[PDB]
């Protein structure tokens, strides 16, 4: 709870020295890397493929400007010709949404059979929950609630 | 003139598992530069991937070229990626040290 | 009898019109009714890359006669100093706003070039134009009023 | 803000016209704009308001010793039609960040 | 069965065939109008 209040306080102060430089002068502000590390969930990992490509993410900017100016072009050839994709298969699963797949991307990969994990990956009878047949709703919602 | 709910990440998925980050910067080095690029190591997680930009417009430009674009076999999907959700894993603070610094150099 | 009242009134613009209406700053030279990009054009025109027309640009530091880079033109282009101009320049002469490439149409989809006011000048194949008014370019015509550091050419894309 | 939402239910409703609500005054030009960002100034709302029509004489409120406006002005049209059209329509604007209020007198 | 493989095998061999003829044009293209730009910037010396 200190801590909660203590958030505010520095949210308020910080209000206070953007509010302000404007005078001594949005969710676009540039980022950190603790801020980075505070968005996305576990189990990601930041890359540099080079060094130098990363020179190029750098002049991207400038190259933004720069290379859009520049010769460029897409063409195609007459050539003749796998196609891999997932709905969400088990024996039912009903349908998801394509936004949704965010929320139960993990119940989409078949791996299976080996704790918290599972619970959370039993869990998604949230899904059956929210999308279904109403029986599913109900089945779903009871079996839940004794859980 | 843009929809409030797109925000400068990006969900990318149908990767291959063998992908080079070497494509990842050079495809999507197009729309702008790189915030930066994370990739899914986990057994779960892997062949998804997030991409972050200077700019939002960036992104925008980007999954309307991208939508649906072609890798490999594959045509990736390309999401706007959500907000809030799991966050609270890392905390608010340091901001004493910037802060102090902000009102110390300009003074203000 | 001198000031008979300390206010009185305006009947003038305000600083949020013009700012909101224009902003990257509040920028100058909104494009005017008639621009257009070259490419779709050249869809009109029923062309293909082959026989489109595109402009090129071409550089020569104006000390030393080539390519920094190669520009492509195709509806306007912001020519300012570095962020807000899209065509930013290392040259310490330019004002924050140099001057501007539109391209226009007229009768056909034309390049023309329209000085900003900067303070120092620009030079049209070392021959300065005054400000205020659109000025066609023609393939091969060179751009810099005196300050130059650099030099630039426009080329169609044909041969 | 409530204006909008009583177009809403004249338009939803059918009320097909001449029983509209604008004919509640057939008597007024002078429209007031209230919620006025206080940069504004005569020229200016002069000039965003002549778009519906030709706007004789306007009097804004400015407090008479700082000389600065109070927010707010009663503006006076050549034509009525150019005030059903300028309620009916122009309301709900965002103006410098601050959304104007306009209604008849 | 055998005549897809083999056209599909033929025409690509005429694809890459026709982008090899392709690729030395567009480069002398290039190195032509990069000849008239800089005997243009010589006419701007003189």
């Known amino acids: 709870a200190e801590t909660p209040r203590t958030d505010r306080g520095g949210d308020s102060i910080g209000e206070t020295p953007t509010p302000g430089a404007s005078k001594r002068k949005e969710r676009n502000r540039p980022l950190s890397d603790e801020e980075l590390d505070a968005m996305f969930p576990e189990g990601y990992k930041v890359l540099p493929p080079p060094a130098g490509y990363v020179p190029i993410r750098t002049p991207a900017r400038k190259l933004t400007a720069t290379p859009t100016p520049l010769g460029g072009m897409t063409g195609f050839h007459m050539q003749t010709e796998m196609k891999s994709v997932n709905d969400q298969p088990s024996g039912n699963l009903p349908f998801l949404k394509p936004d949704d797949i965010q929320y139960f991307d993990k119940l989409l990969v078949d791996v299976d059979e080996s704790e918290e994990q599972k619970e959370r990956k039993i869990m998604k009878l949230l899904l059956k929950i929210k999308n279904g047949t109403p029986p599913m709703r109900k089945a779903a919602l009871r079996q839940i609630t004794d859980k | 003139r843009l929809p409030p709910e797109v925000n400068r990440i990006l969900y990318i998925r149908n990767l291959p598992y063998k992908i080079t980050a070497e494509e990842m910067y050079d495809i999507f080095g197009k729309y702008g530069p790189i915030r930066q690029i994370r990739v899914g190591n986990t057994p779960e997680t892997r062949g998804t991937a997030y991409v972050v930009y200077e700019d939002i417009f960036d992104a925008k430009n980007a999954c309307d070229h991208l939508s649906g674009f072609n890798v490999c076999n594959r045509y990736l999907v390309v999401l706007y990626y959500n907000a809030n959700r799991a966050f609270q894993k890392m905390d608010t603070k340091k901001k004493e040290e910037q802060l102090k610094l902000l009102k110390e150099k300009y003074g203000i | 009898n001198l000031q008979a009242q300390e206010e009185e009134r305006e009947f003038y613009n305000a600083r949020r019109r013009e700012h909101r209406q224009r902003n990257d700053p509040g920028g100058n030279n909104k494009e005017k009714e008639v621009p257009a990009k070259e490419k779709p054009s050249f869809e009109l025109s029923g062309a293909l890359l082959e026989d489109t027309n595109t402009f090129r640009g071409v550089v020569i530091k104006y000390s030393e006669p080539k390519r920094w880079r190669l520009y492509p033109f195709k509806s306007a282009y912001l020519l300012g100093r570095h962020p807000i101009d899209h065509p930013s320049c290392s040259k310490q002469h330019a004002v924050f706003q140099y001057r501007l490439v539109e391209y226009t149409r007229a009768d056909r989809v034309k390049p023309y070039i329209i000085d900003l006011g900067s303070g120092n000048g620009t030079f049209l194949n070392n021959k300065r134009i005054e400000p205020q008014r659109y000025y066609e370019l023609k393939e091969k015509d060179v751009l810099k009023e005196i300050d130059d550091e650099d030099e630039e050419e426009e080329e169609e894309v044909s041969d | ?105 | 069965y055998i005549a897809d493989r083999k056209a599909r095998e033929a025409v690509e061999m005429r694809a890459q065939v026709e982008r090899k003829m392709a690729q030395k044009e567009k480069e002398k293209h290039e190195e032509k109008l990069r000849e008239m730009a800089q005997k243009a910037r010589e006419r701007r010396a003189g």
Not at chain 4, 24 to 50: H, M, N, Q, R
Not at chain 4, 65 to 72: E, L, R, Y
């Open chain 4, 1 to 105: 803000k409530l204006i909008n939402e009583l177009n809403e239910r004249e338009v939803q409703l059918g009320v097909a016209d001449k029983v509209s609500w604008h004919s509640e005054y057939k008597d007024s030009a002078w429209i007031f704009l209230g919620g006025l960002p206080y940069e504004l100034t005569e020229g200016d709302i002069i000039c965003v308001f002549s778009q519906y029509g030709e706007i004789v004489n306007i009097n804004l409120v400015r407090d008479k010793k700082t000389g600065k406006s109070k927010g707010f002005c009663f503006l006076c049209y050549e034509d009525q039609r150019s005030t059903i059209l300028a309620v009916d329509n122009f309301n709900g604007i965002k103006i410098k960040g601050r959304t104007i209020r306009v209604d008849h007198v």
